[PDB]
Amino acid sequence: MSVQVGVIMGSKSDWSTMKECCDILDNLGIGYECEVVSAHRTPDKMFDYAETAKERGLKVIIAGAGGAAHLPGMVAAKTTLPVLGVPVKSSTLNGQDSLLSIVQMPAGIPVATFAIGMAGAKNAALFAASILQHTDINIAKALAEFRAEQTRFVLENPDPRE
Amino acid sequence: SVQVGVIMGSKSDWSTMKECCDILDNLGIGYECEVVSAHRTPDKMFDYAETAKERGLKVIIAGAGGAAHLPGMVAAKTTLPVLGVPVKSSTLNGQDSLLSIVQMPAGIPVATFAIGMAGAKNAALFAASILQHTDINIAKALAEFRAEQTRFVLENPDPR
Amino acid sequence: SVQVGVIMGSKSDWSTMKECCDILDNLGIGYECEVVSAHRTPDKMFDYAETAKERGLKVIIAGAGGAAHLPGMVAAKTTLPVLGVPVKSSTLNGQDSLLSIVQMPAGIPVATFAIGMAGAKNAALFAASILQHTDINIAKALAEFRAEQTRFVLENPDPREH
Amino acid sequence: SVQVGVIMGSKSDWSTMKECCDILDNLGIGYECEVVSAHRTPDKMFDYAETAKERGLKVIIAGAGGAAHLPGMVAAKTTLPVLGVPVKSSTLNGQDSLLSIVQMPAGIPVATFAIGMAGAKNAALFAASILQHTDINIAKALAEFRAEQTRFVLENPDP
Amino acid sequence: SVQVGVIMGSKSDWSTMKECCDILDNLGIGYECEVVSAHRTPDKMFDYAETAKERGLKVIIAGAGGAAHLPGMVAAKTTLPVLGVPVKSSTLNGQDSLLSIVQMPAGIPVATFAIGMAGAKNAALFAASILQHTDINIAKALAEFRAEQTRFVLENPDPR
Amino acid sequence: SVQVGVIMGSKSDWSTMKECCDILDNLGIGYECEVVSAHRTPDKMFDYAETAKERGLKVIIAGAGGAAHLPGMVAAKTTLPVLGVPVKSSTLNGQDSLLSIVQMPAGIPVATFAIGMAGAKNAALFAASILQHTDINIAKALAEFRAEQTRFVLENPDPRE
Amino acid sequence: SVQVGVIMGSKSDWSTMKECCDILDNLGIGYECEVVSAHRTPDKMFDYAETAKERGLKVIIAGAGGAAHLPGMVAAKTTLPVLGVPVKSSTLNGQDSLLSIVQMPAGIPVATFAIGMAGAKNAALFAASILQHTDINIAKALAEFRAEQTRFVLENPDPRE
Amino acid sequence: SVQVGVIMGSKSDWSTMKECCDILDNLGIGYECEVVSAHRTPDKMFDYAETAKERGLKVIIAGAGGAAHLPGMVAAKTTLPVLGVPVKSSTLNGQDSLLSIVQMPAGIPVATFAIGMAGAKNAALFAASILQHTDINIAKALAEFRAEQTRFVLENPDPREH
Ligand SMILES: [Cl-]
Ligand SMILES: [Cl-]
Ligand SMILES: [Cl-]
Ligand SMILES: [Cl-]
Ligand SMILES: [Cl-]
Ligand SMILES: [Cl-]
Ligand SMILES: [Cl-]
Ligand SMILES: [Cl-]
Ligand SMILES: [Cl-]
Ligand SMILES: [Cl-]
Ligand SMILES: [Cl-]
Ligand SMILES: [Cl-]
Ligand SMILES: [Cl-]
Ligand SMILES: [Cl-]
Structure with missing residues (x-):
């Protein structure tokens, strides 16, 4: 596990x-x-x-x-x-300060920015996986299973009154 | 290719x-x-x-x-x-654009860059940073690109 | 149906x-x-x-x-x-949701309602206003809904208890 | 009519x-x-x-x-x-207009569209989508509108 | 009255x-x-x-x-x-309320106060300031309200 | 006066x-x-x-x-x-102006109007509503101002030429 | 003093x-x-x-x-x-506070810090950075406060605890 | 110097x-x-x-x-x-710039001034107010600047002046 x-x-x-x-x-x-x-x-x-x-x-x-x-x-x-x-x-501005401070990089030095908070933390990991999968079969498989699972979960539970 | x-x-x-x-x-x-x-x-x-x-x-x-x-x-x-x-965007200066792209819930990520031309440039540079891992010529080109922009500022310190 | x-x-x-x-x-x-x-x-x-x-x-x-x-x-x-x-939304209180929905460019419209429960209720009522044109039971039901919400306000005009 | x-x-x-x-x-x-x-x-x-x-x-x-x-x-x-x-609006770029229209409390709905000309156009197209149920020629005109806007993008892929 | x-x-x-x-x-x-x-x-x-x-x-x-x-x-x-x-407002913290009230075009004015309880209180005080010109008792009551809120701070300088 | x-x-x-x-x-x-x-x-x-x-x-x-x-x-x-x-304001289109005026805490009120010329016109009209209860000529003038602005719209209903 | x-x-x-x-x-x-x-x-x-x-x-x-x-x-x-x-602020989370302080027109400056407790702390540190010029004891106290905060992060690299 | x-x-x-x-x-x-x-x-x-x-x-x-x-x-x-x-900034009228500068967490302060030209001028004037304590000529110059700006308004009270 490198x-x-x-x-x-x-x-x-x-x-x-x-x-x-x-x-x-x-x-x-x-x-x-x-x-x-x-x-x-x-x-x-x-x-x-x-x-x-x-x-x-x-x-x-x-x-x-x-x-x-x-x-x-x-x-x-x-x-x-x-x-x-x-x-x-952020407790005061709800991550609006954080978001602008990260995403609004001028041209030359990029930062790939995700959603404010936990959604963005999880998505950054999934995106990193999406980069690493090109040279790591285990990662390609694990990411594919992740996405298969999240699709299956919605398909198997269509009725929100459940 | x-x-x-x-x-x-x-x-x-x-x-x-x-x-x-x-x-x-x-x-x-x-x-x-x-x-x-x-x-x-x-x-x-x-x-x-x-x-x-x-x-x-x-x-x-x-x-x-x-x-x-x-x-x-x-x-x-x-x-x-x-x-x-x-x-x-003409009405809200990309505020709408930015929020509509960046605020993806957990599960399906989109890597988001600055509003406008700055973002368009940086997405290209970020793509270069993904591709350099398996392509020597791209790593070199991106390294040179960064050296060029650094040099441009270092050789032009006086704003007058 | x-x-x-x-x-x-x-x-x-x-x-x-x-x-x-x-x-x-x-x-x-x-x-x-x-x-x-x-x-x-x-x-x-x-x-x-x-x-x-x-x-x-x-x-x-x-x-x-x-x-x-x-x-x-x-x-x-x-x-x-x-x-x-x-x-x-938990981070931006529906500001993202609202802009993501209402700011559709010309050609493909989405009728947008208020953030949250108020919008959910209003979308139902707007659907009623579309469907009443070919259904008399819906017309009566909507007319009655509007008459009742009007009566509720009118029946209790002074909010002071003491 | x-x-x-x-x-x-x-x-x-x-x-x-x-x-x-x-x-x-x-x-x-x-x-x-x-x-x-x-x-x-x-x-x-x-x-x-x-x-x-x-x-x-x-x-x-x-x-x-x-x-x-x-x-x-x-x-x-x-x-x-x-x-x-x-x-x-000249001062606040329609943010005032938008919140004043869309934020109706429960009971009296207003279907809201984009700020400015985009919303004006979309309101017309949405009115068509309401009227098409009882009107054949409008159903036809809206179908043809959508088909043509799709064709225009398909014919012009290179920017 | x-x-x-x-x-x-x-x-x-x-x-x-x-x-x-x-x-x-x-x-x-x-x-x-x-x-x-x-x-x-x-x-x-x-x-x-x-x-x-x-x-x-x-x-x-x-x-x-x-x-x-x-x-x-x-x-x-x-x-x-x-x-x-x-x-x-629960969703937008009264930002919608504030713009919906204050941004009246020229012709029909609405005097607008702070979002929430602060503005409610201030509208009552402003009503008093409109009415004071027609009644010495309201004028005195308002002068006394102000005098008191001022004295309350002067008498209590230490936040500790 | x-x-x-x-x-x-x-x-x-x-x-x-x-x-x-x-x-x-x-x-x-x-x-x-x-x-x-x-x-x-x-x-x-x-x-x-x-x-x-x-x-x-x-x-x-x-x-x-x-x-x-x-x-x-x-x-x-x-x-x-x-x-x-x-x-x-030039940078924030009067967003700063508006919050800096309207958001007075309880105790000291300021009656706030729209950003820009709209608010300036409306502050004058509001002043008139405060003072009309004082000079029949001001009450009449304000009532006429409203009638004229209403008449501009009622007599000119079609926006098309 | x-x-x-x-x-x-x-x-x-x-x-x-x-x-x-x-x-x-x-x-x-x-x-x-x-x-x-x-x-x-x-x-x-x-x-x-x-x-x-x-x-x-x-x-x-x-x-x-x-x-x-x-x-x-x-x-x-x-x-x-x-x-x-x-x-x-309770309504607007200090947005009104911030704009009302920072957006001073040219001529009368106010040095503005973050909304809330972070800004209170930073104002104190910034005051120290003004006073250190003619007060060696304040210069030393500030230098050590910064060394302390740096050392703390360096000594606690692991976010589990 | x-x-x-x-x-x-x-x-x-x-x-x-x-x-x-x-x-x-x-x-x-x-x-x-x-x-x-x-x-x-x-x-x-x-x-x-x-x-x-x-x-x-x-x-x-x-x-x-x-x-x-x-x-x-x-x-x-x-x-x-x-x-x-x-x-x-062109896109966000310095709202991004402002939050990126002013919202420093506790420990490393940055004194922030207004967005744009007003803030640049004010930064210069604030620097003068720091330096005046150990520079007599700067104290005199800043005092004169403040007196002049006050005078200018006092000498031009009527906005109808033309
Ligand atoms: Cl920078
Ligand atoms: Cl599917
Ligand atoms: Cl969605
Ligand atoms: Cl360097
Ligand atoms: Cl799109
Ligand atoms: Cl009624
Ligand atoms: Cl209302
Ligand atoms: Cl297609
Ligand atoms: Cl209206
Ligand atoms: Cl006093
Ligand atoms: Cl204050
Ligand atoms: Cl002022
Ligand atoms: Cl270090
Ligand atoms: Cl003076």
Whole structure:
């Protein structure tokens, strides 16, 4: 089970969201590491994490932050690996700040952005799977079964009065 | 060889999506560009998405505005990564576009980029970052692209 | 006869859409209710929309939240009137749902109602206003519904208890 | 025959609402068009709404901007389906118009469409989708409209 | 003497509008309270507005939420000053209420206050400021209300 | 009889606030107009508010944009009714103006009108409704203003040419 | 030695502004904390601002919600740096507070921080970053606060706990 | 003497940040101005921030648009006060810029000013209010600026002036 995804977040308070990303990676049998890496409070460590990611065997980085969420964009500035950004739902502005701070990157350094909150955490994992499946048969199979399952679940339960 | 499918809901999106295509050309990445309407050509859209993998595509980049459903619906019908570009809408300046693309519930992801030209450029660059993993020439091209933009700023520090 | 199809992207929408169904029952309008996911069951969605007219449906009421594509994609595949109900999302309180539904470009319309339960109820009542033109029992039932809600306000004019 | 009432809050709304009327013309749907202000002509508004059904109208399409009350207040006074078109306001780009029309509490519905010209067009097309059940030529005109818009995109795939 | 009409779109608005009525009581201003639904009782609404002046009302205070049409529609049918209170809506936190009331085009004004209880309270205080010119007792009651809220803060500088 | 004070934070607001003054002229209501800056002339703003009532004013109409503090701060310093006009700001289209005026907490009210010229016109008309109960000529003028605007619509029902 | 004035429009802002005071205490910075309402005590607010420099204050931190005018109005009446903290309003979650503080037109600046407790804490830290220039003990306290927060994240990399 | 560093993410920010520099010029405040991109020149940004205090800078004014990370990331790497100017973006009129700058979590502050030109001017004036404590000539210049702006309004009370 090779470690192919780095899941990183600006603070421990982002874990209730980011754990849902790790849960999907676990369910899909994808190897990952999870770490608190703060753009603001540990900037030098953030640069190091990004700089070394490729040589460490990582293929995708998933980064979550809230508020003025700079972590995903700053990582993306320092690696050519694909970076996925998860806007963590802020208590004040409901992740609207997080979302704009991540998605509105000017041209040159992209961050793939997903839905605010847990929906986006889970979707970032599934999207990472969608990238990794091209060179990992186990992942292709696990992702296909995931999608087959979610389709089957709706088809088998059509009546909402159940 | 055609590895990226660049699609958009209408011809009016071309002024945005052309910038995505310009980057793929610059990086030596094969692509096709096509108008595919989720609302006006729903059957073609389903067929496009269903056949993408077997036609050799590795990534789909989809642009739409307003109630922008094209990226999410293509994503529902292919296992390939789909990148969504919110097109700047005349009434709400892409606010509608962005929310309609990015706020996908858990299960079917769409990787979303900035509203407008910025997003169209970054989706192309992100596609390059997916494709570089198995293509040396693309890794080199993307590395050079980044060096070029870095150099442009470093060699032009005085804003006057 | 079944004249209205009430559909929703997920079972989590039933707490909103059951309020639609409650009004159709009160007005004696025939309907079916079903979970039809635009993202997880896209094929069934197309099939449902494609055949609704030949099945005898005259209106479709479709609820969805977040990036809410169900109403619009149904409307792309049927010439029947499609009524869209934006389900109140947990992050953005239905703002995403509303914009995702109402901001349809010219060519394929979706009639949109208020976010949440209010919209669900109103879609049912709007369906009644479409169907009363060829059904006298529905006309009477709607006239009575409107007369009763008017009486309720009039019967209790001063809200002070003391 | 006149089956659609197209009303608007002020003459300044006509650059938007004319786009509704153009689609109605194209589909062969008879209509009347009038300026009916909720705030400047409230009695005329109530009168218009009250008699619409008895005058043979089947659908009312109402456009207004800003604090846009015309659609909702018409809907309050007719049992006919009322379609609401939020006009693009100069200050807030129709966000006021949109919320003022779509956010009706339970009991009196207004079917709401996109802000601006897009919603004006879509209101016309939705009126057609209501009227097609009882009218063959309208059913035909709407089928042909949809077929032609689909063909136009299929014929023009290269941007 | 009943000089202020306090009206509201539904009974559920009473939790907000009660706060308006409380201030009018504290200032010794006569008022009436009534549920008047723009949408469910439109004829009653027109009759309320048409007869207000002849009934001796001087100010109307109208609360409503969502697509809040009551204040504007009353203002269209009376030349009396109409104060609007956007009631805090469950979905959009009164943003719909606020725009629906404040964004009246030129011709028929509605004086608009804060969303929720704050605005309800302030509409009552503003009614007092309109009426003060015609009654020394209301003028004194309002001056005293202000004097008291000022003294309450000066006397309590320490938040600790 | 100068009964209404029309004030604004800056000269750049005059294109909006002149429309308020135009209605007051049309209705025969006496007024004065002045540039009074809450941030650049705070002392003058306090003095203006403090002395309004003794100077004969009955209503103050105040326009400002951005972080629009003039209406609320004038209302803090006079017992007279204050009418606030959110001026359309260049960056946020008067969203900032509107929230900065209307969202006064309980205790000190400001009657707020629509963003821009619409609000400026409507503040003047609202001032007229406050004052009409005082001069039969103002009541008549306001009633005529409404009749004329109604007549423009009733006599011109067809938007098509 | 009292160098920072921490003021707020109402006592209900204390659960937010207390977090500012906690940081100033931890950094050893002298402060005073007072309720000063721009709308209910406008004269006191003018006098506070006018005499702040005389009283030895170097920075003023001002919190307010809703139509939040306290920071801008203090800034109009002192040349001392004024830091604005937008308090989280119950209706609009501090959006009104934020726009009312930050969108000051050119001429009278207010340094604005995040909505709510994060902004209260940051205003205190920012005040420290002003005072460190002429106070070596404050320079050292701030440097260590930042080293402490950095070390804590570095020592706790694992989000499981 | 150079006491203020004025930096901006891109040359397109100059039409806004030039207004900051104009005020600094008018007040007699020494500054330097440079394009420093958080995303395209991250190492240079870090270097600029790290060395600012030892180069004799006392205040940094940073402007950026969109997902505006420059001010926060500079603030993470210097103990000096950082002033943030949200540049008015084409799409979202600086709403993204503003949230990206002002919504910094606790620990690393950025003093934020109004969106656009107003904020650039105000950042310059706020820098002056920091520097006035140890620079007599700056104190005099800022006092004169405030007196003049007050005078201008007092001397032009009638908006009908022509
Ligand atoms: Cl570090
Ligand atoms: Cl097709
Ligand atoms: Cl689309
Ligand atoms: Cl399916
Ligand atoms: Cl959906
Ligand atoms: Cl209207
Ligand atoms: Cl009634
Ligand atoms: Cl209402
Ligand atoms: Cl002065
Ligand atoms: Cl102001
Ligand atoms: Cl006082
Ligand atoms: Cl305040
Ligand atoms: Cl660099
Ligand atoms: Cl940046």
